[PDB]
Enzyme design. Structure first.
Site, short mmCIF file in Angstrom:
data_model
loop_
_atom_site.label_atom_id
_atom_site.label_comp_id
_atom_site.label_asym_id
_atom_site.label_seq_id
_atom_site.Cartn_x
_atom_site.Cartn_y
_atom_site.Cartn_z
CG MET A 24 -4.26 -5.26 -1.37
SD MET A 24 -5.21 -4.98 0.11
CE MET A 24 -3.94 -5.52 1.57
CD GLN A 25 5.56 -9.62 -2.47
OE1 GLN A 25 4.69 -9.50 -3.43
NE2 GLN A 25 6.59 -10.42 -2.58
CB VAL A 26 1.00 -5.24 2.10
CG1 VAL A 26 -0.04 -5.46 3.19
CG2 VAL A 26 2.29 -4.60 2.50
CE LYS A 41 3.67 -3.61 7.04
NZ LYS A 41 4.71 -2.83 7.73
CG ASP A 135 6.23 10.25 6.99
OD1 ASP A 135 6.59 9.18 6.37
OD2 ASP A 135 5.81 11.36 6.33
#
Length: 272
Positions: A24, A25-26, A41, A135
């Site tokens: 979608m 690493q994840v 994850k 952010d």
């Protein structure tokens, strides 16, 4: 702490109890024991030390925020010899992909619920963990099928959402990005979309008047006022989450009933 998934209830589990439904690493995975679909994850012990550090810092904060409803929750963890798998609740999309799906402005009522949620998440971070997100932008604002709006990953807990006092700090630089993100999502246009480089953006942030909400779109005086306060150039006079929470805009939306759920499903069905 490891090998247990907690989603309302607590079920023991191991990596084999999870079926991989793709990236979608994840990964999006399904917990065979219950059918719950979750995000996961995968942090490889061989991975880039810097990236792993982000994951770990983000996980630390996420793990400490179990009492905050406005932040994505960790359901559990599985540690193997060569990997760590972090189970997180799965959301629908970020505010950025909602903006592209919509192909235009997102209604004030949705943005109101969003503001309430994000400001409280950001406030929670500061007061109970001393974290300054650093952010805030549409892609870190998550929504799901149930109408929930939450803050995403803080593996640092862009240059276009940077506050004036950061270009030339405190939690009020996040306040500014929040302002820009709200104007962006409300108008359907990034305020400085005509710039070609990052330095050009800092340039307009500093030399031009703040990019407030237009006056001919039906925005409420509360919403326009709330954005004007977030986009106060002089960070010395810019309100902190403290003050922002008492703003008429926040108050109206803590209270008002808005079906974020339906609006959300309908916009995702316009998948067209």
């Amino acid at each position: 702490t490891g090998y247990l998934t907690i989603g309302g209830q607590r079920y023991q589990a191991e990596i084999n109890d999870l079926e991989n439904l793709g990236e979608m690493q994840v990964w999006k995975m399904r917990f065979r024991k219950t059918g719950h679909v979750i995000a996961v994850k995968q942090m490889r012990r061989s991975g880039n030390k810097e990236e792993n550090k982000r994951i770990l810092m983000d996980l630390d904060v996420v793990l400490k925020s179990h009492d905050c409803p406005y932040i994505v929750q960790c359901f559990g963890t599985f540690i193997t010899n060569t990997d760590v798998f972090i189970a997180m609740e799965l959301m629908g999309t970020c505010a950025e992909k909602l903006k592209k799906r919509m192909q235009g402005p997102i209604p004030e009522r949705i943005l109101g619920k969003m503001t309430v949620a994000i400001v409280k998440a950001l406030y929670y971070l500061k007061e109970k963990h001393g974290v300054i997100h650093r952010d805030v932008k549409p892609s870190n604002i998550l929504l799901d099928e149930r109408g929930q709006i939450k803050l995403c990953d803080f593996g640092i807990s862009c240059a276009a959402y940077m506050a004036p006092e950061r270009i030339d700090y405190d939690i009020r630089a996040d306040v500014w990005s929040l302002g820009i993100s709200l104007v962006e999502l409300a108008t359907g246009q990034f305020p400085y979309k005509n710039c070609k480089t990052d330095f050009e953006v800092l340039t307009k942030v500093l030399q031009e008047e703040p990019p407030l909400l237009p006056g001919h779109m039906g925005f409420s005086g509360d919403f326009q006022s709330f954005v004007k306060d977030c986009l106060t150039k002089d960070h010395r006079k810019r309100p902190k989450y403290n003050k922002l929470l008492e703003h008429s805009f926040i108050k109206r939306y803590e209270t008002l009933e808005v079906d974020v759920a339906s609006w959300f499903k309908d916009v995702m069905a316009k998948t067209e």
